[PDB]
Design a protein around this nucleic acid. Structure first.
Ligand SMILES: [Mg+2]
Ligand SMILES: [Mg+2]
Ligand SMILES: [Mg+2]
Ligand SMILES: [Mg+2]
Ligand SMILES: [Mg+2]
Ligand SMILES: [Mg+2]
Ligand SMILES: [Mg+2]
Ligand SMILES: [Mg+2]
Ligand SMILES: [Mg+2]
Ligand SMILES: [Mg+2]
Ligand SMILES: [Mg+2]
Ligand SMILES: [Mg+2]
Ligand SMILES: [Mg+2]
Ligand SMILES: [Mg+2]
Ligand SMILES: [Mg+2]
Ligand SMILES: [Mg+2]
Ligand SMILES: [Mg+2]
Ligand SMILES: [Mg+2]
Ligand SMILES: [Mg+2]
Ligand SMILES: [Mg+2]
Ligand SMILES: [Mg+2]
Ligand SMILES: [Mg+2]
Ligand SMILES: [Mg+2]
Ligand SMILES: [Mg+2]
Ligand SMILES: [Mg+2]
Ligand SMILES: [Mg+2]
Ligand SMILES: [Mg+2]
Ligand SMILES: [Mg+2]
Ligand SMILES: [Mg+2]
Ligand SMILES: [Mg+2]
Ligand SMILES: [Mg+2]
Ligand SMILES: [Mg+2]
Ligand SMILES: [Mg+2]
Ligand SMILES: [Mg+2]
Ligand SMILES: [Mg+2]
Ligand SMILES: [Mg+2]
Ligand SMILES: [Mg+2]
Ligand SMILES: [Mg+2]
Ligand SMILES: [Mg+2]
Ligand SMILES: [Mg+2]
Ligand SMILES: [Mg+2]
Ligand SMILES: [Mg+2]
Ligand SMILES: [Mg+2]
Ligand SMILES: [Mg+2]
Ligand SMILES: [Mg+2]
Ligand SMILES: [Mg+2]
Ligand SMILES: [Mg+2]
Ligand SMILES: [Mg+2]
Ligand SMILES: [Mg+2]
Ligand SMILES: [Mg+2]
Ligand SMILES: [Mg+2]
Ligand SMILES: [Mg+2]
Ligand SMILES: [Mg+2]
Ligand SMILES: [Mg+2]
Ligand SMILES: [Mg+2]
Ligand SMILES: [Mg+2]
Ligand SMILES: [Mg+2]
Ligand SMILES: [Mg+2]
Ligand SMILES: [Zn+2]
Lengths: 65, 71
RNA sequence: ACCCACUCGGCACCUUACGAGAAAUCAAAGUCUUUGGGUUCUGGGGGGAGUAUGGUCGCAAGGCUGAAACUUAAAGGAAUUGACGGAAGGGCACCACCAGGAGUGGAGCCUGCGGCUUAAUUUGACUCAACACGGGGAAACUCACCAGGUCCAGACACAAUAAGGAUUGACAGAUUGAGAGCUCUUUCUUGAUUUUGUGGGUGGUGGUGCAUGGCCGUUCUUAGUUGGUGGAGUGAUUUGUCUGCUUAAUUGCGAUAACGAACGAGACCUUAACCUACUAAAUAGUGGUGCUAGCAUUUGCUGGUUAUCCACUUCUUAGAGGGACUAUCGGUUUCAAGCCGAUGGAAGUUUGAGGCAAUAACAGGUCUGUGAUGCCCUUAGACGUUCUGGGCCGCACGCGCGCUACACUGACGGAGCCAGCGAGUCUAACCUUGGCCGAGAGGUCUUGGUAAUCUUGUGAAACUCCGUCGUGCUGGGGAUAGAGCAUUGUAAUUAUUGCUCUUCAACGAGGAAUUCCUAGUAAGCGCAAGUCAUCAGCUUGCGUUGAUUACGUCCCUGCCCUUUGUACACACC
């Protein structure tokens, strides 16, 4: 998919030797968190903000200013 | 593949012949020098270059061929 | 006779496993390096071989006893994971079938393949996954093939020749297809650039895709791959990754010695749909106004006018947003994931269609895309290259993709008259409107455009309407062939293509077979783009007209999955 275009660089290189040639194929996948100028995460990613304990009750009452 | 055939007769090349040449020019009894063979009135060939003597034919070789002066 | 409890001794099963084992497994195969209850028998790597020999028993066939030489690095056991089967159980799919549509298979031609022919008819590829494929529509070129002619563009090093010239070129004639000084005659020219030899290079559409890279196709219209902590196992391993249900999906639910995750699917991206909300526009358009034509006249109706001005953004353009999450409701389901129906909605089949796409495999195709490349071959009487000419088109015939037809839901003739995706000329001749001339093809003079500006509203074709014909190989059909005219091109003969007249074939719905397809789809219909000097019956996209039939299954076929067997693991070639 699309994240491929966004996050992985590839290169093929032909390395000519005494016997024949070999194909080097390099693939690098870069930290998307660091994206900088694009999307900062995979389309996959789904973060939930973590609530907060509450200490409720305290029967009514009102503040004045 | 197939290899070879030939109803024969291979073609050769050329030679530039021999000739200890430019004897042509003649100097009299000490020491006046007269040119044999006439030279070229083309601006390109400042009259050092001569004309070969055939028949009808006098011809400038320096002009790689160029021009047909006839006397 | 039957039931309950007990107990000796039987044939067995069940669950455990403290314990054993290399494991499979085992209440003995336990009580074994913490090694001793009694006793009997047999084995000491594989083959050679239960062979030779002697003894013995037998009527015999044979039985018992039973060697060595020599050969050899493994043979063997159990389990694991793969791979594979002409074993079994499940699934998925219009490259499967059901219900059907439109066909192909029959005909004419077009075009590839075989075959034959040939100087040559260059060549790759042969089930799906070779054959309108190599973007492969070849007149030269391309081009590799064939008949023949030039050239070196043979780096460099050493040696040799050699300034008394190493070498170079050529006018005319001869030659030659040729205005190739190819060679020859002849005799000027040139000046250390070459020549000759060896060494070494260099080019090659020469060989090897079974030496390679890269790319691509296929498996795959598939759903699979892995690691952390836990559990099992001495171990390779396994569980997680599973009976079921569910999904297009190892997509999920659920079950659960597993829990929680990552690659792949999904997400993501592109394009088609919806925004009287946002920002705008003489390279897009609308309303008002002026200038103005025509028809009515009573306002009116229908046009002209890239700026005569004013305002707008519904339509067009493209930025930014918004929108859908199978929403609401209800059926159904283990009331789970889901599935179904109704309403709403631009939109509810993964929204439609694509792009991307893991792990692994193949001796799939490509050395003929590459100045990617190993090795082999070849290298001046070239397999380098170029030039002239022919050839890839050759035709008893087999095969594939196609085009056009057999007519009356039609052909012909008037007339109506509507798309979308494209593309176009600088140091050049591309897209072409308009005016004339021409039956046509085309010609000619001008013209706008490097483009939302001009071609172009690309006035496309099927289609619609009024006529002619009237079922007759007919006015359906347009093969084959003759004559003439033009266009591209240096060149049109074997006829590039276009036009006119004439000639008027087979084909009366196509055997056995076989392809493709579920909605703006199928089928019909044209167009633009690729190729392109010229040539589309091909492709790639595009819009126009627009259905019948399923919404299911495992019968055929194909494939994945379990279970199972394996003496395979280079893995059933
Ligand atoms: Mg995806
Ligand atoms: Mg002289
Ligand atoms: Mg056990
Ligand atoms: Mg035990
Ligand atoms: Mg017991
Ligand atoms: Mg032994
Ligand atoms: Mg023996
Ligand atoms: Mg005996
Ligand atoms: Mg005996
Ligand atoms: Mg007897
Ligand atoms: Mg014995
Ligand atoms: Mg014996
Ligand atoms: Mg031995
Ligand atoms: Mg096994
Ligand atoms: Mg059927
Ligand atoms: Mg049929
Ligand atoms: Mg060839
Ligand atoms: Mg296939
Ligand atoms: Mg040629
Ligand atoms: Mg030459
Ligand atoms: Mg040499
Ligand atoms: Mg050599
Ligand atoms: Mg080559
Ligand atoms: Mg291969
Ligand atoms: Mg390869
Ligand atoms: Mg081959
Ligand atoms: Mg399908
Ligand atoms: Mg499994
Ligand atoms: Mg695993
Ligand atoms: Mg799938
Ligand atoms: Mg009025
Ligand atoms: Mg009025
Ligand atoms: Mg708008
Ligand atoms: Mg509705
Ligand atoms: Mg979409
Ligand atoms: Mg092969
Ligand atoms: Mg290649
Ligand atoms: Mg080669
Ligand atoms: Mg190429
Ligand atoms: Mg390359
Ligand atoms: Mg060659
Ligand atoms: Mg051909
Ligand atoms: Mg064939
Ligand atoms: Mg095909
Ligand atoms: Mg008509
Ligand atoms: Mg005329
Ligand atoms: Mg102009
Ligand atoms: Mg338009
Ligand atoms: Mg008839
Ligand atoms: Mg007709
Ligand atoms: Mg011709
Ligand atoms: Mg021919
Ligand atoms: Mg007729
Ligand atoms: Mg029919
Ligand atoms: Mg052509
Ligand atoms: Mg075209
Ligand atoms: Mg083609
Ligand atoms: Mg067995
Ligand atoms: Zn001269």
């Amino acid at each position: 998919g699309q994240p491929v275009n966004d996050f992985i660089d590839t290169a093929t290189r032909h390395v000519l030797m005494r016997q024949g040639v070999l194909g080097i194929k390099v693939k690098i996948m870069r930290d998307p968190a660091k994206s900088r100028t694009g999307p900062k995460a995979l389309p996959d990613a789904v973060t939930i903000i973590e609530p907060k304990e509450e200490e409720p009750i305290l029967a009514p009452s009102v503040k004045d200013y | 593949x197939x290899x070879x055939x030939x109803x024969x007769x291979x073609x050769x090349x050329x030679x530039x012949x021999x000739x200890x040449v430019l004897s042509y020019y003649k100097v009299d009894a000490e020491g006046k020098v007269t040119k044999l063979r006439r030279e070229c009135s083309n601006p390109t060939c400042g009259a050092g270059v001569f004309l070969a003597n055939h028949k009808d034919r006098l011809y400038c070789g320096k002009c790689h061929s160029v021009y047909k002066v006839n006397a």
